[PDB]
Amino acid sequence: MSAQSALSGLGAKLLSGEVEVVDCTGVLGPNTPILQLPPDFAKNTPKVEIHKISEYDSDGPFFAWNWMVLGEHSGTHFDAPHHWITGKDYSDGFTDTLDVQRLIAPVNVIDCSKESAADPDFLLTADLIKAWEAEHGEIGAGEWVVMRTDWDKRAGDEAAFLNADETGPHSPGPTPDAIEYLLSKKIVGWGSQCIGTDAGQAGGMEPPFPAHNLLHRDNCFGLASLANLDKLPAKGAILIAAPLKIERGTGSPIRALALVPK
Amino acid sequence: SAQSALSGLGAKLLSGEVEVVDCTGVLGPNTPILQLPPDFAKNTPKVEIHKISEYDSDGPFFAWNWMVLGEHSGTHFDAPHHWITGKDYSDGFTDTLDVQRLIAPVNVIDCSKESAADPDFLLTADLIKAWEAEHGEIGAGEWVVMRTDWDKRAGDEAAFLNADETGPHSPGPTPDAIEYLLSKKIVGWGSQCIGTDAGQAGGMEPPFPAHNLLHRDNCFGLASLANLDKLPAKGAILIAAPLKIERGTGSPIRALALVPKA
Numbered sequence: 001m002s003a004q005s006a007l008s009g010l011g012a013k014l015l016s017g018e019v020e021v022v023d024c025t026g027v028l029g030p031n032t033p034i035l036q037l038p039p040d041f042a043k044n045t046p047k048v049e050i051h052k053i054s055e056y057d058s059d060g061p062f063f064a065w066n067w068m069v070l071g072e073h074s075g076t077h078f079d080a081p082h083h084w085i086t087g088k089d090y091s092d093g094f095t096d097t098l099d100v101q102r103l104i105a106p107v108n109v110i111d112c113s114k115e116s117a118a119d120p121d122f123l124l125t126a127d128l129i130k131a132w133e134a135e136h137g138e139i140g141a142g143e144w145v146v147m148r149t150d151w152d153k154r155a156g157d158e159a160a161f162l163n164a165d166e167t168g169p170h171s172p173g174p175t176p177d178a179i180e181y182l183l184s185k186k187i188v189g190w191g192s193q194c195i196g197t198d199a200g201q202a203g204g205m206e207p208p209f210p211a212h213n214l215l216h217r218d219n220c221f222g223l224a225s226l227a228n229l230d231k232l233p234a235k236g237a238i239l240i241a242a243p244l245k246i247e248r249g250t251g252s253p254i255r256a257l258a259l260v261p262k
Numbered sequence: 263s264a265q266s267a268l269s270g271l272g273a274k275l276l277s278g279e280v281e282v283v284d285c286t287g288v289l290g291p292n293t294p295i296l297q298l299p300p301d302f303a304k305n306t307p308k309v310e311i312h313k314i315s316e317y318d319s320d321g322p323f324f325a326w327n328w329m330v331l332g333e334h335s336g337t338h339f340d341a342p343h344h345w346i347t348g349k350d351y352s353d354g355f356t357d358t359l360d361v362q363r364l365i366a367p368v369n370v371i372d373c374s375k376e377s378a379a380d381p382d383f384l385l386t387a388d389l390i391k392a393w394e395a396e397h398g399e400i401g402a403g404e405w406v407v408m409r410t411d412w413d414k415r416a417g418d419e420a421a422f423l424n425a426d427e428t429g430p431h432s433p434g435p436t437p438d439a440i441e442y443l444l445s446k447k448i449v450g451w452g453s454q455c456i457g458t459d460a461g462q463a464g465g466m467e468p469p470f471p472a473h474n475l476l477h478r479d480n481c482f483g484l485a486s487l488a489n490l491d492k493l494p495a496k497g498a499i500l501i502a503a504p505l506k507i508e509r510g511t512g513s514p515i516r517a518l519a520l521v522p523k524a
């Protein structure tokens with residue numbers, strides 16, 4: 001029941017496989033889907049590039065390695081509060097100044113996959129979250145909450161992943177009141193399997209991009225392009241979602257990992 | 263059971279009874295980066311951070327950056343493909359390795375005093391055996407890290423690389439040290455220096471035995487680890503997970519340790 005026993009126990013169960021590490025990360029490379037914004041509205045974050053330095057050749061006889069062109073907000077990634085104007089004044093709101101204690105926490109996995117398959121603009125509401133809590137247990141302070149949509153099935157095709165038509169991107173997300181409600185429970189942050197933490201059509205919500213707006217307003221975090229949420233239980237897993245320690249970073253690609261039973 | 267264990271661990275993380283320790287240095291333009299003889303090999307590039315927008319006409323509501331980022335930059339992870347000796351492992355890339363292996367108990371071997379006295383200090387098999395006699399045997403799947411407090415030098419790249427006419431002078435393991443650890447079936451070896459080997463490992467047999475032997479055995483390397491002085495010799499869990507770079511040879515990481523409180 002001591003912390004040391006918990007950690008030794010974790011170590012043993014990892015070796016035996018009784019605790020499994022789930023990879024919640026998509027592949028990071030040139031094909032990784034990247035956010036597209038209207039050019040008149042904002043500059044785009046760049047597509048990922050991987051450049052060879054050497055691979056056991058005359059440029060590097062005994063070793064292989066690469067360098068990258070890499071936006072902070074690329075692939076499975078982390079949003080720090082400085083990312084949004086509402087979080088701009090937190091001195092601790094950068095990837096290098098935030099509290100790493102907050103990064104590893106129990107995760108609440110809200111399965112919206114059937115609803116999102118039927119309607120790509122599916123919105124998770126405060127009422128639906130409360131019904132989820134009624135069934136699974138209350139969402140608690142410091143916990144991660146992630147919206148499972150199985151949108152990662154589309155990640156091999158950027159067009160399919162952004163899912164845009166004449167009126168813009170169509171991908172599921174939260175309502176402003178859903179995020180407001182989660183924040184009232186003092187969550188650490190909110191995660192999506194889509195290109196961002198907000199619905200594709202959030203550009204037209206009040207406020208616009210409410211997850212971004214409200215999370216970062218409250219010094220909380222966002223996660224995007226999460227994979228393999230279908231391998232997690234609704235309750236009980238621990239999510240590890242840690243940004244690179246980028247100097248004054250607004251966000252970071254991550255290796256999101258989850259600990260799950262069995 | 264596994265679920266009860268994860269619930270108990272989750273509660274302790276939320277409460278701080280298990281502390282998350284940041285073992286990562288800041289990643290930015292001033293991060294020390296390996297230098298190689300240009301007649302020998304091309305260099306991995308210095309880190310660059312470039313503004314896309316900061317709540318301005320380029321992006322009115324948000325701030326974000328993009329990076330020039332070598333795989334092998336700052337606190338970072340070496341996958342087996344990084345060395346010629348690990349080239350044939352299909353699971354030897356950051357996107358094909360087994361994430362189950364990345365989280366494990368860590369052995370923190372304090373060589374800080376020895377390293378302050380002699381920057382070319384070498385950890386030997388006999389010294390590791392003496393550490394085990396005091397602290398306990400090193401076990402299968404565990405991380406082993408060499409604490410030197412070299413991270414205290416990261417503010418001055420020249421001091422961090424510490425080169426003179428005969429090359430870099432920084433502490434590391436002997437060949438027999440790495441062979442001994444590998445016989446205990448460790449997952450990986452970590453350093454606070456620019457790489458996993460001693461600065462003078464070029465004249466060793468074999469050259470750069472950490473790189474050579476670790477990756478020969480499909481095991482991992484960690485470099486530029488920070489804050490090992492905040493870890494116990496035994497009992498902590500280390501989380502060291504590379505980005506899921508497509509065919510990646512390594513990656514910057516947010517190295518985090520779990521340490522127990524009471």
Ligand SMILES: O=C(O)C(=O)c1ccccc1S
Binds near residue numbers: 073197198209251
């Ligand atoms: O990458 C992000 O954090 C993200 O989702 C985003 C970034 C910039 C502008 C709008 C959005 S909606």
Ligand SMILES: O=C(O)C(=O)c1ccccc1S
Binds near residue numbers: 458
């Ligand atoms: O993998 C690394 O960053 C590393 O330590 C290294 C890389 C290339 C050449 C020599 C070394 S010694």
Ligand SMILES: [Ca+2]
Binds near residue numbers: 101
């Ligand atoms: Ca704390």
Ligand SMILES: [Ca+2]
Binds near residue numbers: 121
């Ligand atoms: Ca419709």
Ligand SMILES: [Ca+2]
Binds near residue numbers: 228
């Ligand atoms: Ca999958």
Ligand SMILES: [Ca+2]
Binds near residue numbers: 417418
């Ligand atoms: Ca300096």
Ligand SMILES: [Ca+2]
Binds near residue numbers: 428429462464465
């Ligand atoms: Ca030499």
Ligand SMILES: [Ca+2]
Binds near residue numbers: 489490491492
């Ligand atoms: Ca320290």
Ligand SMILES: [Mn+2]
Binds near residue numbers: 073079224251
């Ligand atoms: Mn983002």
Ligand SMILES: [Mn+2]
Binds near residue numbers: 334338339457485512
């Ligand atoms: Mn390296």
